[PDB]
Design a protein around this ligand. Structure first.
Ligand code: NAG
Ligand code: CA
Lengths: 105, 105
């Protein structure tokens, strides 16, 4: 981590030491982009994100991480609105609004 | 009012029981700019006639032999009316079917 703090990236993990074995369907990356991992990133796409590529467990390139931490296609992500969670193809309407959940938005 | 009697449950803050479920429910609305419900359209299958054949055929399971042990423990008739309404008028009649059957179970 101090190496990465100076921009030097080391492939130091091996089967003989400290493999970062991942939860659920996720896959290890020595450097992955954090800004678009979660379904919330689909639900709040206008928010800026600039955080560096970093070590961890990530979903494969076409899938987003759901609330329970497994990886789902973009169409299967739930949507977040007023802090409440809506499933795909949910509809609601109110005196002020009419909204629906698709592609995590 | 949880007094063991159905006959006064449509009581309202004015202290009278409205014979119309609409005026009853309207009298408990918290906000003044909310629209008063003028009439409650029972049996909404008229607005989607494509749904009625499945709504009948599927919700009739509540009165089929599979629930027969329950039919004398809880009357199925309100749950059957609720099921046919749900399946005829919701975003996914399969989910609404399962919710109505689960509600009776
Ligand atoms: C996240 O963004 C990268 C590009 O920065 C892209 O390669 C990847 O497919 C994206 N992930 C998802 C789940 O779309
Ligand atoms: Ca009562």
């Amino acid at each position: 981590a101090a190496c990465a703090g100076r921009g030097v990236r080391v492939a130091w993990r091996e089967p003989g030491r400290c493999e970062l074995n991942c939860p659920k369907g996720q896959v290890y990356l020595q450097c992955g982009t954090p800004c678009n991992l979660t379904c919330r990133s689909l639900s709040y796409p206008d928010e800026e994100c600039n955080e560096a590529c970093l070590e961890g467990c990530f979903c494969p390139p076409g899938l987003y991480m759901d609330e329970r931490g497994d990886c789902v296609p973009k169409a299967q992500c739930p949507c977040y609105y007023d802090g409440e969670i809506f499933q795909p193809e949910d509809i609601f309407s109110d005196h002020h609004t009419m909204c629906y959940c698709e592609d995590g938005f | 009012n949880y007094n063991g009697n159905q006959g006064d449950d449509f009581l309202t803050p004015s202290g009278l029981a409205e014979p119309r479920v609409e005026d009853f429910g309207n009298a408990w609305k918290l906000h003044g700019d909310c629209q008063d419900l003028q009439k409650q359209h029972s049996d909404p299958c008229a607005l989607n006639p494509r749904m009625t054949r499945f709504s009948e055929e599927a919700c009739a399971v509540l009165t089929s032999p599979t629930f027969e042990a329950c039919h004398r423990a809880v009357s199925p008739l309100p749950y059957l009316r609720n099921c046919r309404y749900d399946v005829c008028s919701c975003s996914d009649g399969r989910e609404c079917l399962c919710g109505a059957l689960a509600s009776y179970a």
